């Protein structure tokens, strides 16, 4: 049930889907000094978080999406000094 999106700089998407959580992941092709995620649920307010780094990947757990919840998410990632921001991706729980 997870989703992946690919760009030469990254694979990113949703993984780790359980009844009470999903994980937004961002796996860059070049090591990043930091990655932020921007998210909204059912078109609510935008929330911004520094992702957690683990083994060269970056993660954010989103808890308590009910079935039918729409999660929209974008990233700002560092690469070799500057940072870059993606489009908004969509996931339906
Ligand atoms: Br893909
Ligand atoms: Br690298
Ligand atoms: Br944060
Ligand atoms: Br967009």
From Swiss-Prot:
The chain holds residues 928 to 1020 of 1020 of the full protein. It is found in: Secreted. This is Glucan endo-1,3-beta-D-glucosidase. Belongs to the glycosyl hydrolase 81 family. It comes from the Bacteria. The CBM6 domain binds the non-reducing ends of beta-glucan; this domain may therefore target the enzyme to polysaccharide termini in damaged regions of the plant cell wall susceptible to catalytic attack. The CBM56 domain modulates binding affinity for beta-glucan and aids binding to insoluble beta-glucan. Residues 1-93 form the CBM56 domain. It comes from Halalkalibacterium halodurans (strain ATCC BAA-125 / DSM 18197 / FERM 7344 / JCM 9153 / C-125). Cleaves internal linkages in 1,3-beta-glucan. May contribute to plant biomass degradation.
């Amino acid at each position: 049930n997870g989703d992946s999106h690919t760009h030469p700089d990254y694979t990113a998407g949703i993984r780790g889907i359980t009844g009470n959580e999903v994980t937004i992941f961002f796996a860059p092709t070049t090591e990043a000094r930091y990655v932020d995620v921007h998210l909204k649920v059912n078109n609510g307010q935008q929330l911004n978080y520094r992702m957690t780094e683990r083994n060269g990947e970056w993660e954010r757990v989103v808890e308590n999406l009910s079935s039918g919840d729409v999660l929209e998410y974008s990233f700002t990632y560092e690469k070799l000094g500057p940072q870059y921001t993606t489009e908004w991706f969509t996931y339906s729980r």
